[PDB]
Design a protein around this nucleic acid. Structure first.
Length: 93
RNA sequence: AGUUCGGCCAUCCUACGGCGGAAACUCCUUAACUCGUUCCGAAUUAGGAAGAGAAGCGCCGUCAGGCCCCGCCAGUACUGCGAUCGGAGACGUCGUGGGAACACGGGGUGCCGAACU
RNA sequence: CCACGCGCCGCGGCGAGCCCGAGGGAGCCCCCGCGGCGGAGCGAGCGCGAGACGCCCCGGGCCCGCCAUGCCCCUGCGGGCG
RNA sequence: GAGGCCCGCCGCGGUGCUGACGCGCAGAUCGCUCGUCGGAGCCGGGCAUGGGGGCGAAAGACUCAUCGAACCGCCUGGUAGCUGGUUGCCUCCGAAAUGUCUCCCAGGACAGCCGCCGCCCCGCAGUUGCGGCCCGUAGAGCGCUGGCCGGCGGGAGCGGGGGGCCUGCCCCUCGCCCGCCCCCCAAACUCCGAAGGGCCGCGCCGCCCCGCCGCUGGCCUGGGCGGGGCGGGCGAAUGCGGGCGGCGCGUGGGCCCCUCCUGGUAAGCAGGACGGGCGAGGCGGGACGAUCCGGACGCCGGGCCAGGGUGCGCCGCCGGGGCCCG
RNA sequence: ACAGCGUCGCGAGGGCCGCACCCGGCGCUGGCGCGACGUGAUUUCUGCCCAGUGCCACGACCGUCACCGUGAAGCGAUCCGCCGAAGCCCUGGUAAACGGCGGGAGUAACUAUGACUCUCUUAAGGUAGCCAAAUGCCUCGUCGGGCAAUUUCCGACGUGCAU
RNA sequence: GGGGCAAGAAGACCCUUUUGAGCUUGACUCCAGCCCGGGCCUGUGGGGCGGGGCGGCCGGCGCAGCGCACAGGGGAGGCCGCGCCCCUGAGACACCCUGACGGCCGCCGCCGCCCCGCUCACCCGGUCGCGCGGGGACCCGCCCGGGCGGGGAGUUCGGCUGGGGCGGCGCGCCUGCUACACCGGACCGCAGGCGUCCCACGGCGGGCUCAGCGAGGACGGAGACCUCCCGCGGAGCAGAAGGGCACAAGCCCGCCCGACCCGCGCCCCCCGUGCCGGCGCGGGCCGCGAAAGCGGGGCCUACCGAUCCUUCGCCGCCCCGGCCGCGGGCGCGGAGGUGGCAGAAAAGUUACCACAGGGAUAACUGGCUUGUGGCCGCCGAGCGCCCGCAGCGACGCGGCUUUUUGAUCCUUCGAUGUCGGCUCUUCCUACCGUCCGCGCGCACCGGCGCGGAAGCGUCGGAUUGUUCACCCGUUCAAGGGAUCGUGAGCU
């Protein structure tokens, strides 16, 4: 599918509708200091093998894509999660 | 009578053939602008007024089609509730209730409010 | 069956209270004897903090906290008021 | 005089008999018949190797009547949704085999039914009558969505032909195209349209005046919500007191008889549904049958009499009309 | 099991095993040795295939691939680089390693048969032999022999379910 | 020895159990073992070659100048053997002369690597320590880190299922049926779908009418194109199906993104719980249109997902003895997920096999059904020289039977021993011969068809476990029932 280069959307920090430019959301690098990551490492240490469930059978063709939108005037950030698409791209303005 | 706004939306529709316009409505006649057309002033937007019933329309008229109303179809088809009711059955009685439909024959064929002239 | 925990019911004492806790009293079932639990909640938390009715029940209305919103002002991201 | 040579005794093995025995002489014995018998032979004593270890000319064989992982004690009275059993009496009430889910489908949990405990005062119905809405099943029909068999027409279309034509559709015929008809049809067709079901109503009507509303309107408009007067009354039958909580238990394999079913060629077949029945309902009948026809139960004495019967077993019948190789 | 037959590793600062550890066995041995495996006396032979999977290569040194160590940056927790040992990868070898070893169509002057072509298709397409075998489904195959009579038997035949 | 489904024996057959064991691998998760690096153990040297600390050496034109004033310079004094602001440049070379040492000799516990020794640590061999060697700061050991590793461990190896498996996915969802006119009603019942696709295929306003018949017009026809007509949708609206829709929900055009934000309720499923989808709202903030109005996507009914963990936004809160930076936590609502779809992390095998149970269930007997297998009767298209019927007999039609086989699981798993034979006994008639009639397309002979008839006979053998099958013979040779008669009768 396609998303528009900018969509005029409500921006909460301004409190009014204003144009928002668009990118695509991605997972951030996971820190080794996340509470759960720290716990998983501790559990793994020591003999006994895998201490937590490992999801193995993936059944989903593709992930719903979240479009990050930034309002230029208010620096607002907003995200619209489109339905699952095997390929989506941001149109050039 | 006719207009403008309406309510039920064919008894108000369809196709045809008559009749009528005083007023109304339409037709009509023109782009100087406003406006308007994948092209086209056809439609549309303006600005009118010489006409005109040819249409539209208002009325009739069709052993017209439809749409509608009543019979009849018919206690018929089905079916509710019982039955040591018959029948090898599947089917039909009997008792006690509820009762269609298509056809077919007759008859129809808009009415209502508000403002206005 | 017993122990312990829980839910609820019935009873008995006392009532914004209530309670043989361990213990200690030449004391024996007697006497004295804390926490705890309840009486305030709500919000992740910073924190803030219930009265308005009422035989009872039940809804309604309000109040408190949390999430907003808009006004006003001191000891101000503080207070109050809707 | 040689040989992992041959026959053959003891020995050492154990082939057959499928012999005897088979509660045995015996937890492997006995009889004949056997294989071998100088050899990789047999036998006794000492010793070594120990349990996921040993040992094995391998058969998962053997390791003290145990071996595809010994034996003894212990953890341990391990765990089981799985089997079996679970101890006096009388009385009162009395189910479910269903729904959603769950690594569930031999089980549970929540809900339903049900028991006890109650508490509280409003009215109540698996009913009929009357009023107003709903429905698309049977029937019926083929308008619509498709199936369907043949007649009667009328022609622009030679589609082919048969063909008089210089030739040609210039010559006719059926198809084709419509038209009138007609034969049978539907689960996934509806012009219409039942029976039968569902839902809601059947007491408080008016009149009049304000009150209130950051709600609604051009308004003095509303819409709601209150208070006071002033008129009228209880306005379908029948039966009948309702309402609500608390706390648990079993149950969550069901099966039949009707009736409509799906499906399979069809069943004491496999799935659905209204009701009833058995489950968990004694008793009488149907010869016999958990469910059929009656009747649904304290202990009894009379009487009545259902369903089914009335030659005799075996309680109880005669009369009349018709029929007759049950 | 066996003699025979091959293959494999290893020259003791070693191999293969035991083994909580200390230490052991082979070995009081030394390649005519010791361990590991196949096949199973002769007689006669052992075809083709290294694609794949194993195994082997100071056979390389690419790409990958760690700890450290060392660069930067930071207030420091730290965070990014870089280096990169084996190993994998990569390149060869190896089937008495495990294993594998194809189809259509047209044809001779008896008819038929198919030496002969043609066309796909493989790492290679099954060679010498052998066959209804203890291996052949069809199948109680066909044809001989043996019987009065043969789902057995034997000699043949053999695109042979599946040698 | 016919029965007491005579007793064995909580069936090892077939299932089921969130019951196991032995084995396997390329299951899941791992561990010894070994290989491989870096440290430590662990000394004493020689270097190469960079680095590296010292460590000399020299620098130096806009020069406007007194003159390569490097800059930084500066005074008018001294000691070249000379000056001098303001020279111009900012400050001219007087007694004057110059940073980072800018380039650039030698010395040192400097680091990095590639070597090369030595002996003394650490090992190893000989010997009666009888007149000795070898290796060497490397291996070894150890600590870390990477490999390899069924050689072992531990464990798992879904479900429904007319037994199980296999396949199928009524495992999550949607349309039309089935479904038997509210609703709710099942089937490894009946046709199809869904996991997407589209910032346009969206929102909104405007204009329009769509398929198609007709009948006409250069090339023009089968087909291309344009017109007046009539057109209830016979078009279209993404995709299944069914509903829905005409100055529209179609089609075209112009604008825009409501395919917003903040908080709530209702309906579907339903235990009246989620979840998906919808819907109705209260506030803001936008869009489109003259406006009323409409819009939280694509007409409706399908098109997706809890805890924990991760990530990202947005405002705040907390680190508990304070304070400041960093970082962690949290509230908040989005993503990343569980398709077995209310959501374990997971391969086979077992004839060496155990359990606990179950006919809640397969096998083998039964019994029910009867497609199948036979056996009858109805009709006559026809055949038989002629001629429906002496014998036949199509296409159809109706029955029987248990002798087969399917279906179904009603009974049996703390067990009813299982095929065929041998042996022996009874029974049936749906009769092959013998007996009695009767008809022939019966001269005789022999055949054939009926009705009655179950007394007697239906044998010997070759292959095969055979029942069967087949063949050879003969006094020429029917078919079947008895828990598929007949294992403390046997084999």
């Amino acid at each position: 599918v396609t998303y528009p280069a900018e969509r005029r959307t409500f921006c909460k920090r301004e409190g009014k509708h204003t144009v928002h430019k668009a990118s695509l959301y991605k997972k951030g690098k996971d820190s080794l200091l996340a509470q759960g990551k720290r716990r998983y490492d501790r559990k793994q240490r020591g003999f006994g093998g895998q201490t937590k469930p490992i999801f193995r059978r993936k059944a989903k063709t593709t992930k719903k894509q979240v479009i990050r939108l930034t309002c230029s005037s208010c620096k607002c950030q907003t995200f619209q999660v489109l339905k699952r698409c095997h390929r989506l791209e941001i149109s050039r303005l």
